[PDB]
Subunit: 448 residues, 3 copies
């Protein structure tokens, strides 16, 4: 299942065995809350029950006023992470919102949700959206509160009506609160925006495959984090916002994680040493004949052995980029490195073990809870599997290794940094490539 | 109104037509909650109403204890973003807090807010601050709860008093909760800290121009995000915190966004290619005879065509920096570039279109929802306006273009990367300048 | 106490006098909520009191279902910050969770918390954990609600029971809500997860020194921010999560902050100027014979003169690294610099003053509130202490200086950038070292 290879020659390790789930699409549903047009009334009733009702009705009216004032606002430019392109993530969402502002378009929805709280409506721009009514405050305030306020004055008050209205009104107040401190766009989508039972019901009614229905349902928390809640409009007794859900159009393709660490010579004199680091670390997933590379592997969520990623955070590379692992000098692909005198010690915890880059006088060991040091690392880049090992210590820093099971393969090889004459080594390329470095080396070697 | 130019020669695009709103100042108001000095009482009453009261009174007492324990704490060092200076953002706030700790100074405020809940008080350090009393728990617990607890024992309990106290006490509990997980400083300022109606009332009573009053009021959500809430003190039946609001001392000056993307030769052999990227991307705003440059354009909030920015996230540059757009080789300003073999494909969505840097074998197209591919990009850097275009596809990644209307201008020109001999091109300067590169080029050209 | 030195020769300043508190360990406690196995009942009672009860009981049942669906999920790869290693921070926590899944292991805990709500239990993996029962919903729903629902139908309803159950059930609902939008791991640990009074009680019962008990208690907010809350399991009427607290195994060692800024020549022609910046800025703490260096000083929390840091965000360096401050050319340590033509003006606010790097035509001054400009900076890198100074202005940006008291020392010296011939200066090393630069200089000087 999940296995791992360490390449001694380049101080890198690849964890493989993973399966992809890459977001490639967006499903945009419209969540609605039916509001009520209430004008406050001349009501002379001291009784504290009525007073509490009116205090809650003010909360309601202020939440609406706040959301309206907010909807004047309607709703960028961001180791190889700078290489990423730039795009807006809520774009299909904002697209749907702009349609909802068209005259007559809100009326279309409330008519669909007149006899049911869940329906599929066709918008004038021709997208079919699932529409939910999740909270009907309209008829509640009208057929529960409104008569008490008006008919025969405030005399007929009931404490269970006070408590019930607090409960009903609360979701509106928390919806508003979230939107107010996020300028109208929310992520992850909270359970206020969409409850667990609602989200699941949404997924079951989507135009997605029976396969995808199962996948999204068994990972709702990941779905929430990759979803957006976009405040859209308040119009004609209706509050509406778009919940924008991830479609995973790439599933169960092979994924592997590349871990890299600095590779340095370990000469007696520590200021005559040269270093080299593979710069292409992160997640890789086979995808439509090419490879999707995610430079900031912190953007992918890993569940078991499935990797949930957003394709907006990837570069698309030739599949030949994998040859950098097995042969960094290959002719098919120019493998990326930096040459920056990073002779500082560190560890990188991998899926099934740990890479240790130990230099200078740093203490670098791997331990077991009950048995003490079982491996001492020497100067250089090395590796230990998580089998029998609990912690890794480099200097004053303690790392815990993952204890998930899997096979590790130590691929012995000569550290490639040894192939270079320190006197002509391009000693500071922040972002270079193997052949690029070889080029400059010869260029200065010609000066003889 | 909003227009855009693409410069083919340098693979960059400038969106202009924007108007500035740059924070240059801070208004520091003092928000107060009047507390009560209650000692719990020997009260033998089982009745569940009283029990619920005492459970809420414990919540109150614990919120106070927590805030006091917190106020022992009272309240850094952070594409050209590293060039930014370092300063504390809550400094004028902390300044006001330190004054509130002076003996007699808290008493000055509570006296001002004795007959009203909104007043302007002059502090001993000579700053005039607007002061609000937003919650008077003191006289509530004293003249609603305290007698019930003591006088004639617990016999006189009332359920509407239970529910009302939960409501009153809640804001205190949420104020506390926020402060407790943020070490006393909050941003964005929540509606617990300052309600929508309060914030607006604050803005109307400030010593700012009638112009600025309108601007801040019509963008309260942006104001919230650029505001700070600083827990200050609990002293003499008073809880006080400072809400620190942005003053926009630069308004309606021209702003433009610079978008850049990698510019590479597209020779048959893909490992003999050289690249070049303008590194000066981000927001630019005319400001006091110079230009305020914001390197991380993700720090500015754009509302319609107004750009809200904080001047602490800007560098101050000569106005001549704009000449980099129209003539990157000009003598007046040394235009910044990097030369790092970024021959990986990507897109940058702009305000009115899209830049596409297409290299290697990557599929790069622009599509329309209903009509399919309408433009196919060739190897190189190119551009397409958002007119008639819905999406842009580079490799496995899909971008949506903005659909706001505006004029786009394609400025044809020779890609400047073509002017360089690949044999002497300084092939890895992470942060260089045009003339810097020309210098090194000649330096190695002299070796002949 | 807190003092500071500015080194004119290298445009850097060191603030010292600080005392360390470095996290080196983790204490993992198990927080438990006792749940109840309730099957809903055939109850024909319209009365609104009962209706509200059943609505709250549904909230309870849905919170449990949600947490269970979440626990299918169970629970990386991240100026010198890239040099940091990579490790999982919740590892000892996840370790404890995996043990709690073992059969019989949950039963061990609930038996310990059968007669008390706080006990120390020994897990089968041999770790002694403090275990809390913080909410006993089991016997509440059973001996308060369950009979009302069943026995003699719904006739016996009581409003104080409605309100009380809302209160009891609320913590569960907020625990769930937090976990649901964070995939099961929370930080900072909220007061829902662990109340202020609970956290403190935990600290008092830990196997830590009387010294450490005092330290953690007087800084609970820092403890919260450096803690993790890990959703673990729902099994046998028990909900359990791990709260993972920082152990500070390094305390009261000397800490100092290094501030650096760009150092450039200021020749008449501004495009013939060379620059140099020390790249080793951030926090430094003596630690076990070496120095713990934190490259992103934004990761350390400073309280008074104590510095709270996590050792996972540090590199371990020789103590000789301090010699870079007093003599950047020393033979013992190769001091790190960049040489990147950063001739853009800026300020860095320090602990007791301000560094100003002023270049070009930028206006750079230091002011006092009431007295105006008291210092004007010239082209170059300079410094001013916070004594008598309120603000610093560089270009269009205004900085506030800290007003804490302490001694500042201006160490005069020749700017080292003056020692270099601009014609052979390696004008763009993003991450180099003094001797590295000297090397390349001679290498190109040999070509004569």
């Amino acid at each position: 299942n999940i296995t791992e290879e360490f390449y001694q020659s380049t101080c890198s390790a690849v964890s493989k065995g993973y399966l992809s789930a890459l977001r490639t699409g967006w499903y945009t549903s419209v969540i609605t809350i039916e509001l009520s047009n209430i004008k406050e009334n001349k009501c002379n009733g001291t009784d504290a029950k009525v007073k509490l009702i009116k205090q809650e009705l003010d909360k309601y009216k202020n939440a609406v006023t706040e959301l309206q004032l907010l909807m004047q606002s309607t709703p960028n430019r961001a180791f190889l992470g700078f290489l990423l392109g730039v795009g807006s993530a809520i774009a299909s969402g904002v697209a749907v919102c702009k349609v909802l502002h068209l005259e007559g378009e809100v009326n279309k929805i409330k008519s669909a949700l007149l006899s049911t709280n869940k329906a599929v409506v066709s918008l004038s721009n021709g997208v079919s959206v699932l529409t939910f009514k999740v909270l009907d405050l309209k008829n509640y305030i009208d057929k529960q509160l409104l008569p008490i306020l008006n008919k025969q004055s405030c005399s007929i008050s009931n404490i269970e009506t006070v408590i019930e209205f607090q409960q009903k009104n609360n979701r509106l107040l928390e919806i508003t609160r979230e939107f107010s401190v996020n300028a109208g766009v929310t992520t992850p989508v909270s359970t206020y925006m969409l409850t667990n039972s609602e989200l699941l019901s949404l997924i079951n009614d989507m135009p997605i495959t029976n396969d995808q229905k199962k996948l999204m349902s068994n990972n709702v928390q990941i779905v929430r984090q990759q979803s957006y809640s976009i405040m859209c409009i308040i119009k004609e007794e209706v509050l509406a916002y778009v919940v924008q859900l991830p479609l995973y159009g790439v599933i169960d393709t092979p994924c592997w994680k590349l871990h890299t660490s600095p590779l340095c010579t370990t000469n007696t004199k520590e200021g005559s040493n040269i270093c080299l680091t593979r710069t292409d670390r992160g997640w890789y997933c086979d995808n439509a004949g090419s490879v999707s590379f995610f430079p900031q592997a912190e953007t992918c969520k890993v569940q078991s052995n499935r990797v949930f990623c957003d394709t907006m955070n990837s570069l698309t590379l030739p599949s030949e980029v994998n040859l950098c692992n097995v042969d960094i000098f290959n002719p098919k692909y120019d493998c990326k490195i930096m040459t920056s005198k990073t002779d500082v010690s560190s560890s990188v915890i991998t899926s099934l073990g740990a890479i240790v880059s130990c230099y200078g006088k740093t203490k670098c060991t791997a331990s077991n809870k009950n048995r003490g040091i079982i491996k001492t690392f020497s100067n250089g880049c090395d590796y230990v599997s998580n089998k029998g090992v609990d912690t890794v210590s480099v200097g004053n820093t303690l790392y815990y290794v993952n204890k998930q099971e899997g096979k590790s393969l130590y691929v012995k090889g000569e550290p490639i940094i040894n192939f270079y004459d320190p006197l002509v080594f391009p000693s500071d390329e922040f972002y270079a490539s193997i052949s690029q470095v070889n080029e400059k080396i010869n260029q200065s070697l010609a000066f003889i």
